[PDB]
């Protein structure tokens, strides 16, 4: 509700007035120095900061600045002073316009006590034209207390939804996280969907993101869909929420294609083959006119700006960043007094940096594609200084940090096509500008005393047309059947990455069945599972993991890996087709071992 509000602080109580703020329309406007970023609560709902002018001393809660009224030189204003422990009083004066060093500002020569800082300044019209900007005491001397406010904004903020529901229409939402968000926009469109009685699907990249949607949509009739279920259908006003990989593995497994006519994919830039595949299908369903869909992303496929916009200002520092352990030179890493996010190209690389900064006495959390859904909640819960992470953190991973150290690198999987066909982990090579923009994205979403900093190294590379994922999604995609007998294609811009012809990867009969199984139960990469299945090898049959050249022998910690089979024999792990991803990290390999023995 609109008006004037006192700002009380306690814990342990405590209870003293720090300043005054103004709620107008639906947004709260007070001084920066009063809250300094701290959250607020009242009779209904908490308040999150989104806009703040650091030096200019003013902050906005629940969207950008809203106060649209200006003072004019030589006039008459009214400071509605809300003294701490005292009743509101209007104070009128003739406000002087004095010289600063930037230019010229208007102010009032009035003195009120600390904890009044942020009282409204009212014009003859009645609309608030500024805030009581302490201070005070400017040279020279006495006062003066500045008439402090920003320029009209614009946009910022705040709704309402365009009719993006009309079938055969696809929308990209260049959502800015920090303004709100899956907090404000997603329930808003979901609500509107139910009113239009549309078969709705929400697609969230990780599980823990979907879990964050679940609560952001508490009350709403929404059912999470376990991937261990081929299809679920209740036949009532219900919104399915699932992981991207759930959607595609369902489209693969079950023949019961539910005819959603609305599909909202959050973080639609995920280049995981499952996600690419999903985007492929959903796109074709839009084309059918059988569906309309929304793709939420800060960096839509195609986008190449490594420095997009943010709701909070980011400093972009370019430096040298270590790849192994360090000693001297790189003190700025350690010297920093705040929470940091660090992107490493691989899990192995991760372990160095951690071990190295662990010596400095820094509480570091490690993140990888597997450990993520088990390690990310710890970044909220426990106290820490450094989260080292792989590029998994590009998918809606929200951290409360101030710095991202991003050596701008990664490993990309590649299929070499000379003699034997195999997948290797190329690099570390430079990331995509999109992926850079995304890593940087983690930072600079909360207004902060110091602007958040993106500390990077090197220029990204656009071309990833040899990435396995694209051709891996093609084989994923064109093994999903449709009731209209149409072959699904890669989604628009993403098409130009695959040089393959449409459908060529199609697997007939119950080879197709194996290909699904290998991915779903045996838990193998798409390329691998494809080559094994299309060889007519049954899912139980494992004796292919032992027929390779000298070259194909898998290694673990510099030693030949030798496994104990189901029928019981020690055999050197030597796949026919070599896919690097199965041994790229211990847990992957550990898991592949279990498969190869027959215990899966």
């Amino acid at each position: 509700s609109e008006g004037v509000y006192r700002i009380m602080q306690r814990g342990l109580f405590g209870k003293t007035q720090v300043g005054v703020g103004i709620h107008m329309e639906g947004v709260f406007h007070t001084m920066w120095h009063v809250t300094r970023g701290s959250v607020i609560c009242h009779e209904t709902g908490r308040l999150e900061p989104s806009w703040a002018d650091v030096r200019n001393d003013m902050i906005s809660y629940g969207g950008g600045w809203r106060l649209g009224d200006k003072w004019d030189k030589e006039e008459d204003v009214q400071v509605l002073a809300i003294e701490p422990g005292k009743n509101p009083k209007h104070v009128q004066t003739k406000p002087g316009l004095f010289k600063t060093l930037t230019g010229e500002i208007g102010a009032v020569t009035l003195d009120f006590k600390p904890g009044t800082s942020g009282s409204p300044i009212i014009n003859k019209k009645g609309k608030v034209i500024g805030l009581y900007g302490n201070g005070v005491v400017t040279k020279s001397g006495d006062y003066v207390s500045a008439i402090t406010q920003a320029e009209r904004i614009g946009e910022p903020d705040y709704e309402v939804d365009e009719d993006i529901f009309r079938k055969k229409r696809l929308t990209i939402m260049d959502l800015h996280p920090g303004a709100g968000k899956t907090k404000r926009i997603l329930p808003s469109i979901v609500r509107e969907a139910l009113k239009r009685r549309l078969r709705t699907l929400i697609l969230a990249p990780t599980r823990v993101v979907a879990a964050e949607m679940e609560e952001a949509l508490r009350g709403l009739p929404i059912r999470y869909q376990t991937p261990a279920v081929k299809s679920d259908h209740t036949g009532r006003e219900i919104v399915d929420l699932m992981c991207h990989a759930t959607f595609t593995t369902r489209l693969l497994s079950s023949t019961r294609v539910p005819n959603y006519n609305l599909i909202v994919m959050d973080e639609a830039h995920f280049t995981d083959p499952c996600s690419v595949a999903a985007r492929g299908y959903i796109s074709t369903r839009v084309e059918m006119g059988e569906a309309a869909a929304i793709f939420m992303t800060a960096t839509p496929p195609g986008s190449t700006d490594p420095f997009p916009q943010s709701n909070s200002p980011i400093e972009d520092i370019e430096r040298e960043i270590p790849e192994r352990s360090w000693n001297t030179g790189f003190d700025w890493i350690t010297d920093y007094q705040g929470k940091t996010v660090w992107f490493v190209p691989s899990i192995k690389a991760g372990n160095d940096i951690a071990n190295c900064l662990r010596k400095s006495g820094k509480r570091v959390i490690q993140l990888s594609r597997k450990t993520f859904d088990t390690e990310y909640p710890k970044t909220k819960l426990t106290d820490w200084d450094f989260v080292v992470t792989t590029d998994i953190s590009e998918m809606g991973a929200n951290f409360r940090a101030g710095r991202v150290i991003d050596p701008r690198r990664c490993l990309k999987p590649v299929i070499l096509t000379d003699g034997p066909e195999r997948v290797i982990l190329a690099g570390p090579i430079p990331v995509t500008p999109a992926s850079a923009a995304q890593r940087r994205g983690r930072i600079g979403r909360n207004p902060a005393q110091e602007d958040d900093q993106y500390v990077f190294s090197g220029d990204p590379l656009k071309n990833d047309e040899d990435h396995a994922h694209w051709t891996e999604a093609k084989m994923l995609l064109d093994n999903i059947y449709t009731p209209e007998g149409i072959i699904p294609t890669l989604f628009g811009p993403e098409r130009e990455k695959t040089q393959a012809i449409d459908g060529e990867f199609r697997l007939r009969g119950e080879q197709r069945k194996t290909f699904v199984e290998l991915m779903r139960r045996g838990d193998l990469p798409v390329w691998l599972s494809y080559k094994v299945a299309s060889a007519g090898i049954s899912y139980k049959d494992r004796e292919w993991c032992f027929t390779g050249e000298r070259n194909n022998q898998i290694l673990e910690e510099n030693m030949e890996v030798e496994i104990w089979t189901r029928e019981g024999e020690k055999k050197k792990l030597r796949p026919k087709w070599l896919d690097a991803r199965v041994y790229a990290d211990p847990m992957a390999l550990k898991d592949f071992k279990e498969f190869a023995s027959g215990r899966k």
């Binding site: 509605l80 009212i122 608030v128």
Partner: peptide
């Protein structure tokens, strides 16, 4: 949280 609100006033010019 540790900060709170208390509605003390409404915005209007004194005629």
């Amino acid at each position: 949280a540790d900060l709170s609100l208390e509605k003390a006033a409404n915005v209007q010019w004194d005629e």
